mmCIF file of C-alpha atoms and ligand atoms in Angstrom:
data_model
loop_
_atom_site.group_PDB
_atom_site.id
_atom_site.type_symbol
_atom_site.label_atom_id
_atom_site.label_comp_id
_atom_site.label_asym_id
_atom_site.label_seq_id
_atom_site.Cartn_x
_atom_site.Cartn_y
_atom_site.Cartn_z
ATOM 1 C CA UNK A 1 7.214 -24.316 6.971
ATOM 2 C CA UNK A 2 8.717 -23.848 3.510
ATOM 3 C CA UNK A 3 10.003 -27.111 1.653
ATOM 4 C CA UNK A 4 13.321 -27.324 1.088
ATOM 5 C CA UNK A 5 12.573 -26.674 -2.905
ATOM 6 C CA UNK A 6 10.897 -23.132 -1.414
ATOM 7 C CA UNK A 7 13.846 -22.339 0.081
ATOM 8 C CA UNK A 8 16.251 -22.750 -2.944
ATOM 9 C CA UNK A 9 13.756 -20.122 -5.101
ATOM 10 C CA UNK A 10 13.868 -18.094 -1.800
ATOM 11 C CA UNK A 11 17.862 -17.830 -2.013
ATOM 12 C CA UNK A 12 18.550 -18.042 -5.771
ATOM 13 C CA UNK A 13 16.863 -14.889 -5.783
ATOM 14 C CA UNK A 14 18.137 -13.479 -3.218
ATOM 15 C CA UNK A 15 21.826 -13.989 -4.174
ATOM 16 C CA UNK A 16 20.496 -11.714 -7.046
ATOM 17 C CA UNK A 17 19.838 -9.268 -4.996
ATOM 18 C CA UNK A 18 23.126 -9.294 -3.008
ATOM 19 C CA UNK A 19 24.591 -8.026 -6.876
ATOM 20 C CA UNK A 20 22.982 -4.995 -5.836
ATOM 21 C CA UNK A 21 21.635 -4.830 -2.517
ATOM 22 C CA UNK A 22 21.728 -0.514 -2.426
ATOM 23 C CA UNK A 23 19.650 -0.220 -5.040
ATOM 24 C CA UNK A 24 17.492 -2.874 -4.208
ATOM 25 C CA UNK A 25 17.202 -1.107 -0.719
ATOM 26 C CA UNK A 26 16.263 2.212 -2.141
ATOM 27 C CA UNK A 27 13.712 0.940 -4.522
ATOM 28 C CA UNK A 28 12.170 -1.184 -1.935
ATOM 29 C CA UNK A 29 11.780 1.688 0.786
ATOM 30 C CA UNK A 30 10.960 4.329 -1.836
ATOM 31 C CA UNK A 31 8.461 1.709 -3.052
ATOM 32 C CA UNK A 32 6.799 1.836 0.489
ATOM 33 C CA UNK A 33 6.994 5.274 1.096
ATOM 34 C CA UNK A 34 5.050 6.129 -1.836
ATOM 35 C CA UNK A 35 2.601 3.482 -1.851
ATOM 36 C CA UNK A 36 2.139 3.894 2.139
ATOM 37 C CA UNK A 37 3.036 7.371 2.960
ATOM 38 C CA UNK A 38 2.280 6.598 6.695
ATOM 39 C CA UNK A 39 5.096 3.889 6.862
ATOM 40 C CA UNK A 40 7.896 7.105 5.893
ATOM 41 C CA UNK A 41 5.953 9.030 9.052
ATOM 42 C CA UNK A 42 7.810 6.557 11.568
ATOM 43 C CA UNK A 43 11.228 7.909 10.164
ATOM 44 C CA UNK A 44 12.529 10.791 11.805
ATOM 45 C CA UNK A 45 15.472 10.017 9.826
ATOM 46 C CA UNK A 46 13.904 10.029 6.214
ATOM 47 C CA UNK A 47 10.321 12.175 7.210
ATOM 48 C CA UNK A 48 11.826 15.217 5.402
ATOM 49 C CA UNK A 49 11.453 13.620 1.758
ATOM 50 C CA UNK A 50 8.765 14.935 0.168
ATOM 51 C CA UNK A 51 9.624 13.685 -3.534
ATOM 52 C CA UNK A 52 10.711 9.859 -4.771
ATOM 53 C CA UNK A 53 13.518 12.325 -6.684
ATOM 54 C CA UNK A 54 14.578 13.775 -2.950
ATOM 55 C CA UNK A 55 14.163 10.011 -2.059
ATOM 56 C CA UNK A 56 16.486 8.345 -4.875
ATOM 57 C CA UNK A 57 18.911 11.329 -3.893
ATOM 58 C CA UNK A 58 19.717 10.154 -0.128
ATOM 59 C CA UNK A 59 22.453 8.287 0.346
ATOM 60 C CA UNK A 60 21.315 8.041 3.870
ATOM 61 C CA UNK A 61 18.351 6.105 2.383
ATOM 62 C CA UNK A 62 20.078 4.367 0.659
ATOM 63 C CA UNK A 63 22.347 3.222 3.338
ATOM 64 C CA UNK A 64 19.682 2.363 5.157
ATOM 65 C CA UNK A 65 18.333 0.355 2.420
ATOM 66 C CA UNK A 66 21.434 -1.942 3.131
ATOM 67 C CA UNK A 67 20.945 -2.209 6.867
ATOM 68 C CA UNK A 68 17.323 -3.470 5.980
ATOM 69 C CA UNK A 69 18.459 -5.603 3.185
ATOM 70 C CA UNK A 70 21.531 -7.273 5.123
ATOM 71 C CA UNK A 71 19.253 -8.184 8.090
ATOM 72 C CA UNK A 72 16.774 -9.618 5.782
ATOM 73 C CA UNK A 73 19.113 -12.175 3.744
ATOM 74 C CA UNK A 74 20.656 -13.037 7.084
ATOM 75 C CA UNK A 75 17.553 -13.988 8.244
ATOM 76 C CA UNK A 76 16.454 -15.624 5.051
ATOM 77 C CA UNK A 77 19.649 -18.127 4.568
ATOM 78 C CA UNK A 78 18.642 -19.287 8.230
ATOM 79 C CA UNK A 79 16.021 -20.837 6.279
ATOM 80 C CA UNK A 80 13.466 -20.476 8.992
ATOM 81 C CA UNK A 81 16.226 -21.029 12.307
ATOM 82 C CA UNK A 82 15.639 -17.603 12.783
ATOM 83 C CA UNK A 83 15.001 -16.855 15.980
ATOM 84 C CA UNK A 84 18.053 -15.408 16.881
ATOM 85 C CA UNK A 85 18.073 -12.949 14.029
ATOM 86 C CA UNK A 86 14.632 -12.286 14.358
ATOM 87 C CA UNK A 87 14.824 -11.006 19.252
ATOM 88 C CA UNK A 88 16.487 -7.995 18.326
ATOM 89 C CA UNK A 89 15.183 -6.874 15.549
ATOM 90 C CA UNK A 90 11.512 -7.675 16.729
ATOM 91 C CA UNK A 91 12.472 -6.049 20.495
ATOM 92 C CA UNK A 92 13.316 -2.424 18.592
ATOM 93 C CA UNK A 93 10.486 -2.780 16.324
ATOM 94 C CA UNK A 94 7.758 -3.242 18.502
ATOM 95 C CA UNK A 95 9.060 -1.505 21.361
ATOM 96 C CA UNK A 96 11.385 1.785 20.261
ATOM 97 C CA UNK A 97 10.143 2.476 16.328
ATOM 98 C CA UNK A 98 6.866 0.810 17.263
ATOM 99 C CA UNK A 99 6.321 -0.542 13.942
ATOM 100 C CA UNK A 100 2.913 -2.364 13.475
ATOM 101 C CA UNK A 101 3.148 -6.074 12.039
ATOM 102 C CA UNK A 102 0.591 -4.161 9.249
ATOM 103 C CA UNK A 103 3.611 -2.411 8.393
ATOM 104 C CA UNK A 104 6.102 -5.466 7.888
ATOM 105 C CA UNK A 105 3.576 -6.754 5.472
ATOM 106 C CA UNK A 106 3.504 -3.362 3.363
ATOM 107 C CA UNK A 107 7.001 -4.281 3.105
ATOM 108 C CA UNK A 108 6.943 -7.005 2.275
ATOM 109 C CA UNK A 109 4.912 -5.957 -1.001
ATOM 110 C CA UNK A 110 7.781 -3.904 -1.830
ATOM 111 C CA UNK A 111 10.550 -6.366 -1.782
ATOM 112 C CA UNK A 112 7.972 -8.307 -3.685
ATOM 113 C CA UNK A 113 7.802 -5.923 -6.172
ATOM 114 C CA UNK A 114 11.121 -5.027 -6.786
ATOM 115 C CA UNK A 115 12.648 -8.485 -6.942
ATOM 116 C CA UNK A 116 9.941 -9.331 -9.321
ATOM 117 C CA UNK A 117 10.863 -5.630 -11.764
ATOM 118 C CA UNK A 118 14.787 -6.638 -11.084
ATOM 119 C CA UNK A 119 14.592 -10.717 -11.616
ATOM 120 C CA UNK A 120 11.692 -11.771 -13.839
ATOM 121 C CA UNK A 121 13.705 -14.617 -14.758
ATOM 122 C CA UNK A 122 14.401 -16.053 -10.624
ATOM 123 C CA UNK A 123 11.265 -14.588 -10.041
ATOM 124 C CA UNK A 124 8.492 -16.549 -11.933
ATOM 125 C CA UNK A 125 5.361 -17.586 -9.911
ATOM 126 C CA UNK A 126 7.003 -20.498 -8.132
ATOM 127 C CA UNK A 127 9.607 -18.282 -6.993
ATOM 128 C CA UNK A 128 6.681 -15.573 -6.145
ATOM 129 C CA UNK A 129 4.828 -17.952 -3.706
ATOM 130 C CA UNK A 130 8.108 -18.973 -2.067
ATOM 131 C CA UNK A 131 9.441 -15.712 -0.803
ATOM 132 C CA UNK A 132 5.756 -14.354 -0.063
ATOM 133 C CA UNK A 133 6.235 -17.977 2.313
ATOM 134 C CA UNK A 134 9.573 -16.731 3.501
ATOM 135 C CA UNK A 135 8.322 -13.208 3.761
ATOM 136 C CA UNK A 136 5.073 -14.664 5.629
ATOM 137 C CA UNK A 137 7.314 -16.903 8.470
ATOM 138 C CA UNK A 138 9.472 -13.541 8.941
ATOM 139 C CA UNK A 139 6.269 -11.957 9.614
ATOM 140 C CA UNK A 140 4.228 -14.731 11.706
ATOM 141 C CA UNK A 141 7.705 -15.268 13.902
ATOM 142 C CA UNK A 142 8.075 -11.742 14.711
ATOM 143 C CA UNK A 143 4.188 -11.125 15.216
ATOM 144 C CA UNK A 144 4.678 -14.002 18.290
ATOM 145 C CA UNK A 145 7.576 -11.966 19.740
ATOM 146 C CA UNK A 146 4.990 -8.615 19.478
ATOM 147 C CA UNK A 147 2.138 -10.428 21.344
ATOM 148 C CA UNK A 148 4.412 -11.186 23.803
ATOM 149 C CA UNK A 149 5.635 -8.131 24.921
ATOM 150 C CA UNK A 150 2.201 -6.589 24.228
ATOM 151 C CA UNK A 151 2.245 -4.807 20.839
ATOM 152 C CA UNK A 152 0.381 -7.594 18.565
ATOM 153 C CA UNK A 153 -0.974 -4.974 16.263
HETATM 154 C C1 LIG B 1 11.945 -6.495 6.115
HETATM 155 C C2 LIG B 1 11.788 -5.795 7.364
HETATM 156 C C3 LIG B 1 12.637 -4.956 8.105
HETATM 157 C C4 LIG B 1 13.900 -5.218 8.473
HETATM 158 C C5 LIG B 1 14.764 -6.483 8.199
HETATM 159 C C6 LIG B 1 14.354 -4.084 9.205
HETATM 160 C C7 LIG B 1 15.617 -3.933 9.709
HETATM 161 C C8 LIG B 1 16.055 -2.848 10.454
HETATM 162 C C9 LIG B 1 17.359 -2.774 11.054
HETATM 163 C C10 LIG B 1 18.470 -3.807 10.882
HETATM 164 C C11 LIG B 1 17.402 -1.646 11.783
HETATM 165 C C12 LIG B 1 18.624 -1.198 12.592
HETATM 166 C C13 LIG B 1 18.722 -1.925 13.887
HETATM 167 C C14 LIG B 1 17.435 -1.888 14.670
HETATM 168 O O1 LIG B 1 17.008 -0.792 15.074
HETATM 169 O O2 LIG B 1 16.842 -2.958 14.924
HETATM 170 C C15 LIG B 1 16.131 -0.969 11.598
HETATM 171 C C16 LIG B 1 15.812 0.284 12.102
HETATM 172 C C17 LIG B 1 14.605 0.920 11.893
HETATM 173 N N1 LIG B 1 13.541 0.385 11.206
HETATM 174 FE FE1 LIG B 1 13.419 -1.380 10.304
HETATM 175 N N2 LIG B 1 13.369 -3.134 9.338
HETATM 176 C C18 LIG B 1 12.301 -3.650 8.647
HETATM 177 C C19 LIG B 1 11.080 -3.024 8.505
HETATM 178 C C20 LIG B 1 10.700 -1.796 9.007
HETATM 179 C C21 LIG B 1 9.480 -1.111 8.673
HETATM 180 C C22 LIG B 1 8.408 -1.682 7.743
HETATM 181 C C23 LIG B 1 9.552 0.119 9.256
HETATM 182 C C24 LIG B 1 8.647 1.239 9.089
HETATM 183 C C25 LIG B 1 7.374 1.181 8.403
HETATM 184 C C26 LIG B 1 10.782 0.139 10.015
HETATM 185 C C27 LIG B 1 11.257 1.218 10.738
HETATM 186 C C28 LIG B 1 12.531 1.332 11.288
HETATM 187 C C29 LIG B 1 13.007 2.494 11.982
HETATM 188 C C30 LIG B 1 12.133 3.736 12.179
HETATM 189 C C31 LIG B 1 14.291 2.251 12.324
HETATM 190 C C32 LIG B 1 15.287 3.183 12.944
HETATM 191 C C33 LIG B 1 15.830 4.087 11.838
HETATM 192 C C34 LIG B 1 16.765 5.130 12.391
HETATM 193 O O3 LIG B 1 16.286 6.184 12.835
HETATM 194 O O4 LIG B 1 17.986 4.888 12.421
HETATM 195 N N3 LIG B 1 11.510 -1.011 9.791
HETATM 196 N N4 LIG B 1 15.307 -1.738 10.795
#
């Protein structure tokens, strides 16, 4: 459970992010792709890219970038009341792209990252260990929906 203090470094970076939430999208997916080339493998959509130039090139990424980003700050400013947010996404994850919680984490190193390259200023230490909590409850909340319907891994 993050403190209510966690949850204002959570969202003041975050509303940084909303200033550009494209290119935060494409740097955080490119960031995956590269740095876990099996994650890119689960996207027929995107599995043609061979090159982070071919990558920065597709609007289509980068339009997905948005979906990704737009569910993730709408599940952030629920501040941990979630769980409605958190059935469907978790229901197509596990079950139809049959995504393993592994690859929420990897992720969740790339948002990391880039908020950290893009907002060194929101995104001191403090801020750091906040949305690695936030990131953390996303991931232990929809890990409980996977074991459920049988995918925990
Ligand atoms: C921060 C975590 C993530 C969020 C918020 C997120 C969000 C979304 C959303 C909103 C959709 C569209 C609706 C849906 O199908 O549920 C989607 C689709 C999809 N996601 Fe994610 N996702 C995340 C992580 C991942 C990861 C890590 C992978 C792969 C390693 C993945 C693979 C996919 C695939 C394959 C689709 C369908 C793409 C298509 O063909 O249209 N997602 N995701």
């Amino acid at each position: 459970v993050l403190s209510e203090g966690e949850w204002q470094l959570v969202l003041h970076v975050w509303a940084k992010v909303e200033a550009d939430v494209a290119g935060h999208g494409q740097d955080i997916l490119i960031r995956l792709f590269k740095s876990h080339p099996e994650t890119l493998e689960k996207f027929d959509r995107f599995k043609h890219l061979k090159t982070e130039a071919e990558m920065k090139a597709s609007e289509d990424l980068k339009k997905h970038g948005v979906t990704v980003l737009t569910a993730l700050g709408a599940i952030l400013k629920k501040k941990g009341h979630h769980e409605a947010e958190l059935k469907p996404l978790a229901q197509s994850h596990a079950t139809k792209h049959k995504i393993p919680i592994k690859y929420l984490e990897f992720i969740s190193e790339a948002i990391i990252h880039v908020l950290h390259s893009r907002h060194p200023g929101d995104f001191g230490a403090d801020a750091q260990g906040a949305m690695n909590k936030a990131l953390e409850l996303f991931r232990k909340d929809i890990a409980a929906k996977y074991k459920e319907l049988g995918y925990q891994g």
